[PDB]
Amino acid sequence: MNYNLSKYPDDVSRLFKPRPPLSYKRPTDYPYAKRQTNPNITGVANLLSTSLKHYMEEFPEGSPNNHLQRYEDIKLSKIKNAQLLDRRLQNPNVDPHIKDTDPYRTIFIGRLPYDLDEIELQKYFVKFGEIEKIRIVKDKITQKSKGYAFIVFKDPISSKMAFKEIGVHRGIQIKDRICIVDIERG
Amino acid sequence: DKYTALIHDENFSTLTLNVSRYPKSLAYWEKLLNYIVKASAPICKSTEPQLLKLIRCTYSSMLNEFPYLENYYIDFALLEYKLGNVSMSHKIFQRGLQAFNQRSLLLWTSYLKFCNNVISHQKQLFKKYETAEEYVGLHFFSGEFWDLYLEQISSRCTSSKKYWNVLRKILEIPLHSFSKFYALWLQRIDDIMDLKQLSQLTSKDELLKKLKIDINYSGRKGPYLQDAKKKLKKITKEMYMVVQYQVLEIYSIFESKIYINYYTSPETLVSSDEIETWIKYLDYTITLQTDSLTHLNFQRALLPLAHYDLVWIKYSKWLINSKNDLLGAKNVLLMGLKFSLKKTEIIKLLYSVICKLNEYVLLRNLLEKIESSYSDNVENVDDFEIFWDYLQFKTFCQNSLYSSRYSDSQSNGLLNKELFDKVWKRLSCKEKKSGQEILLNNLVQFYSKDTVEFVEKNIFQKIIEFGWEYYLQNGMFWNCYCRLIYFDTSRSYLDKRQYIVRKIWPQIDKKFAQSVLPSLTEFCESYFPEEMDTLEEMF
RNA sequence: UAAGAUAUCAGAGGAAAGUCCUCUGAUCAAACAUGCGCUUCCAAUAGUAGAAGGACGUUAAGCAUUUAUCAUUGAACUAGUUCAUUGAAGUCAUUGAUGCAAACUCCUUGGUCACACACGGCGCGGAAGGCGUG
Hints:
part of a larger assembly; 2 chains; A: 33% helix; B: 28 helices; RNA-binding (chain A); U1 snRNA binding (chain A)
């Protein structure tokens, strides 16, 4: 070609020779102006709603949506989950096991090793003031140590200094586990 | 707007009015156009239709004055191309090719280049090239035309049997650049890599007869195909010996000398040697007897000296006696009558061609068209030849149309009231009309009783009675008046010797008898030796 | 243009609800091997062939069809038709386009393999799948 308005020089531009012009062929589809989807869509007639009864008498009972019952199984199971939780929330001023002296004196300790003892618990927590009581909590259904305890100090300032120190300090290492501390919460 | 601002401009009114004053000068047509394009400088589909229709009628009226301007037919299509109607771009190549009578190289080259892009149909686009080559294929500079055609075969077609078929022709033609086509043949022959591929060169038979090589030779082919090439490459080389002789002849004798191959104008003048080679290059081309190559080489030599008549005569002379086609020679002069500026040597010959062809109603119509040109005063013309060629052919019709009014079946020739009054009005001018005695000498030619008594009384007596000075001092007049009398078949020798010597000789004046005597002695010295003394004593 | 993610499922385990993570099953997928009396295909020389695909090749102006602008003004005209003038656009083509058919020429492809010229398999490959195990 002569002009070649391209980045390349004249040799490289003449190298991309195009195949000669496309032969013309008289078109077979519809012209772009005339193109349209089917118009004159006769609406859902009264005569159609009159001929529904031939269909309705034939299939009067529809088939059961059993794939919906897989969803009605799960959603109703989640509501029954709340009712077992509702059975628990009615049952802390009762438990006997949390019903010694002032709740402002009570530390929660949690994540304690399953294989701690109250004497090692007492050692660590007696670091922050004289103890009035301990109790590790154990599963009443079979006495797996639950991994929490409640520790009543002679003063709430020593209970909150024990809290300070041995929970926000990453969790007090006792035996081999990292033991959160909180106040009673409950 | 841009249109009306150009009309109210001063330079438009002066450049237009200049062209209508001096049409054929061209350099005013060229300024009228070169200006009017620049004044519409953005020339796209945008610009207003009054400005485009005006720039279309400049071109189309300008090519109607100068039909041999190859470039302005190209340049007018490209303007119709960019403006964007390729219908109207074709139409004005068609009108350009027909102007040259289908056989001009630059048009067919710069038509086909364009025609590649817009035809978009296989069988028809090659039909343009087939029609092209039969007119302008043998043109000596056609080298670059074929290089287009071979570019369009390779590119387009699939088979590769047409590419060998066409290239076999270009090998036999004496083009300027022929060696570029033997180089392409020899780049193929080498790249032939199977014996089946020698069938596309030439037939299965003519290989085995003329060269003795066989395609069905099953064996160890390598050396056999290495032989076939060496045997086949040879007869190319013998053809390269043939053509090269024809080219190097034509280059060294003719084409080397011809420095101008284009039109220019009616004011351009060609060199003397350039005319000398075109006259010889045309005679050489007649010898070859290649009719396509002959017609082309007249047309090719016409457009540089299209105004002379020198080539319009020969091109009709070739056609009239060699190719023996007289009706075709009539059309050349009619096409030549327009371009040439002498117009006289043609129109003498052109009358004669019509007469032999027996188309007298045309010629009588043609003589009416040349008397109507001067407004019934051909008699009064300055250049005698137009009158004299008119008169003798105007005579031939009125001998035929009107029956004769004299004895012995003599066609009342120059003596008829229609023509003789044109002649008598011509004689009356005397000193300025400048073709007097030659007209007078053909009035002698009647040689009978009635017609001598006519021409005596109706011209030779009345010329004495009015007594114009110019005619009586010119001895060619008195000589013709004696020869009118002497060769009359009616008179005997006695009265013919009386009537001249007793009456005609004494009517001259003694002062004129100085300058009349030399031409008047010559009549006497040859026909009347007996009465040569009686001449001398009188003067 | 951006964000997120790198098979799904189920069970046991570690940090009542869910998430995160790990080994055990099922199913799904890919790659690689490897089998199936698995399926289909792989061209004369004992001859100058032939199979698949083409030709944007020829015969070929084949044969048979149908196509070549509209508006304005005047004359003649039957009771539409032709001629001339003024404006509008206008792919090229009429050797066309559309339909019908044949003949010829030429191009690309392959196991032109081995054994045998012998009255409904189980030679050595290559190509293409289907199916099954690891």
